[PDB]
Amino acid sequence: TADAVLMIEANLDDQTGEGLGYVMNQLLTAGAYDVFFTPIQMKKDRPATKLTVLGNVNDKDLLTKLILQETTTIGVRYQTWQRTIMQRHFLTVATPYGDVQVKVATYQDIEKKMPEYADCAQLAQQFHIPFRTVYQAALVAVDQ
Amino acid sequence: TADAVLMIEANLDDQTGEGLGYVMNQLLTAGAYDVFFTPIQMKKDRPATKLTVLGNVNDKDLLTKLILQETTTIGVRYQTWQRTIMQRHFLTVATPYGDVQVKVATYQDIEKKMPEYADCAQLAQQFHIPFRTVYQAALVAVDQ
Amino acid sequence: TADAVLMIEANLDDQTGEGLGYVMNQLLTAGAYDVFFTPIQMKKDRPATKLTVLGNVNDKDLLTKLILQETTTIGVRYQTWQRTIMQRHFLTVATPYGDVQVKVATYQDIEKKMPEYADCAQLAQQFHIPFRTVYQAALVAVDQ
Amino acid sequence: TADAVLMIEANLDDQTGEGLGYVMNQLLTAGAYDVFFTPIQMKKDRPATKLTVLGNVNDKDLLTKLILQETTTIGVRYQTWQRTIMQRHFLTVATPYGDVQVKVATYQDIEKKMPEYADCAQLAQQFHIPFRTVYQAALVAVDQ
Amino acid sequence: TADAVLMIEANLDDQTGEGLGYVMNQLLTAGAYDVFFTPIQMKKDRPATKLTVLGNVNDKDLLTKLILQETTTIGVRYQTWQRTIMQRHFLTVATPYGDVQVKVATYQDIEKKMPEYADCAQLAQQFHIPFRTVYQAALVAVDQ
Amino acid sequence: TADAVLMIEANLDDQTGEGLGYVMNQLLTAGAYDVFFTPIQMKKDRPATKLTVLGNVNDKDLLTKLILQETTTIGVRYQTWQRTIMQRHFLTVATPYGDVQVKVATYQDIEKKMPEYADCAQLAQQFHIPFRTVYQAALVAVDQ
Ligand code: NI
Ligand code: NI
Ligand code: NI
Ligand code: NI
Ligand code: NI
Ligand code: NI
Ligand code: NI
Ligand code: NI
Ligand code: NI
Ligand code: NI
Ligand code: NI
Ligand code: NI
């Protein structure tokens, strides 16, 4: 329910998008909770990318050294955030195209249901039907 | 003058812009100081949107549960920032097209004046003249 | 008046921000009407930049060769747009800090006035006052 | 069906966000098919906005004059695009919270169904439930 | 060489990021030359995404139907651009970690050399060294 | 090695890009470690810009008053981050076009080398060769 997460940030104005795509794959393999890019504008007319890494506070040394080894940045900044997390468990639901795992997130009186992307995309590809069609079929099917 | 604000963030890769526009209206109604979207790029080629909520630190539970109920996110992250705020009071100034309320923000020796958008937009619409024309008329008129 | 303008675009996922600042400076010196960057998202999790150059139709070969020379792109795409341009004339107005050229743009029933950035920024730095202060003083002086 | 659409663009580095919200509201009221903002980066370290307006070819003069009147741009560029449009029909479906219009779009072998945002947002506010709850109920009701 | 390229665009304010990653993967598999996302801002406070697809002029119907099938858009807009393409040839160079193909692009007086990302990323992972290390080694080896 | 940095942020929806470019130049002159813009979307259909300032924690008063004097914002938010910084020293390396200073950043076992943009851009301009060509020549030359 209650948690803390480390946020690590770096401003990269001398890194290519190809190399940035490479480092995001490296950071997820290293176990980061999340990684995202933000387009930013830096001095001297430089379109840059901000790299943000979320992870366990005890992975600070791991994720820092990864960033310092694989990107061009001279330094990183990091800070601890708090987190409020819903409770998760999974349901298998039968849809017109097969079973789809549905994520049931709960927090006190709040309950919502999210079909898992992976199941829906695999069924959309196999039966040559749209992703949104399989996803919406799972939503209807989770009504009971 | 001195203050603190809570920042709540969430990365939404499975939420539509229509639904995001809906939640920003909900968050302002709930009394958030500010809400803004940042376009971000997440794993698996997902163009995502970061939702940032600013508000009173005592509204953490209110704004969290709102986000957890109305968006698709499983968790939120939050942290406390400090704030330095200028002093505000309002002046009514007479322009060629009517009275326009002007915000006078002061901080120590710093003084600046901002015509209120709402008055300027209403007068621009009624008299079928550009917004920037009414706004600039208010700026000239605040010189005395 | 009426015109036609060439638009050249390239999607750059293998370019650093440092190099992009260089090519924009190169292209404006060579006479592009305008150059701008658009953050885009490309394949393989790449935060990329779209380079757009606007310029004279007869300068197509110059600006193309410049992009192919200075960026990593293998190709450029281009198309001609039509343009509608306002008529310009300039007012020099006397302020507390010096003369400021004011651009007066007209189109049919449209008349608008923009103090020139170069004048305002130079006098703000030279007289050690905010930019907004010189900008607003020119507006006041264009009242007559 | 087949169509042609006018695209008008302008790069605005001398416009506030407040004024841009005003002109988008002005242009949609005047009958633009659509208006959107794109964040771009311009010369002299300027975070700018590209304004794009889509509209009827015969409305070119109206939308141009509107942009030249309400923004700071000296010119606009425009070009005509071709369009491929799906065929529309609407289903009104009965939900636990009222009727919801469902847009059924078809193209060759394509059939897709989108609950109308206006219906879902209005019933969610009126019945004090999440938007997603009304949206999903319409999906369930379109199962028949 | 000279070419012409089809550009197809759609403004998506009712699409999730998960679904957008799916359609970009679908469109590249179907033979689009390129697909990219642009963050845009639409009406009713909607953070949206513009989908742009570049492709062969004769593939217009395939890519259109794909977009109409997999996204929520009711229509697409398209136009043909001209293209200027550099001439390509490839150098395979021997590095400390294996062979790396180097793309040598030429145009009039222009000669530039780009190590192939696929080669560099594969050898960096296989030999457990940074990407930059394999990239720079190919540059060194292309010195002869 | 270990450090702390102050982050100051402000959301500007009533500031022009020209004025924002002006303030970024002012903030770097005042000694900020870094300044960047992030495009954001705020309420009432406003494309806005987030201004982020990084600097020494003891420059809080300096950088705040600068922002409050030169922009339109009523308040700033700020927080302290931690930093991990690599060790820096400079090498002059001989390339085919002159000496180029190369930044050698080290952190424990990590060593990487970055040619300084300023030297590479000056040599590219003087000899009328691409930036990337001089930068890559410096990379090859730093191999010994
Ligand atoms: Ni089963
Ligand atoms: Ni009065
Ligand atoms: Ni590439
Ligand atoms: Ni020329
Ligand atoms: Ni001086
Ligand atoms: Ni300007
Ligand atoms: Ni009309
Ligand atoms: Ni009620
Ligand atoms: Ni819609
Ligand atoms: Ni084909
Ligand atoms: Ni291995
Ligand atoms: Ni020397």
Swiss-Prot record, chains A, B, C, D, E, F:
A GO term for molecular function: nickel cation binding
Disruption phenotype: Deletion of this gene leads to a loss of lactate racemase activity.
GO-annotated biological processes: protein maturation; viral translational frameshifting
Keyword Lyase: yes
Ribosomal protein as UniProt keyword: no
Swiss-Prot/TrEMBL keywords: Lyase, Nickel
Domain of life of the organism encoding this protein: Bacteria
Induction: Induced by L-lactate and repressed by D-lactate. Is thus regulated by the L-lactate/D-lactate ratio. Makes part of the lar operon (larABCDE).
Family under the similarity heading: Belongs to the LarC family.
Function: Involved in the biosynthesis of a nickel-pincer cofactor ((SCS)Ni(II) pincer complex). Binds Ni(2+), and functions in nickel delivery to pyridinium-3,5-bisthiocarboxylic acid mononucleotide (P2TMN), to form the mature cofactor. Is required for the activation of the lactate racemase LarA. May also be involved in the activation of other nickel-pincer cofactor-dependent enzymes.
The protein, known as: Pyridinium-3,5-bisthiocarboxylic acid mononucleotide nickel insertion protein
The organism's taxonomic lineage, starting at the top: Bacteria, Bacillati, Bacillota, Bacilli, Lactobacillales
Full protein: residues contained: 272 to 415 of 420
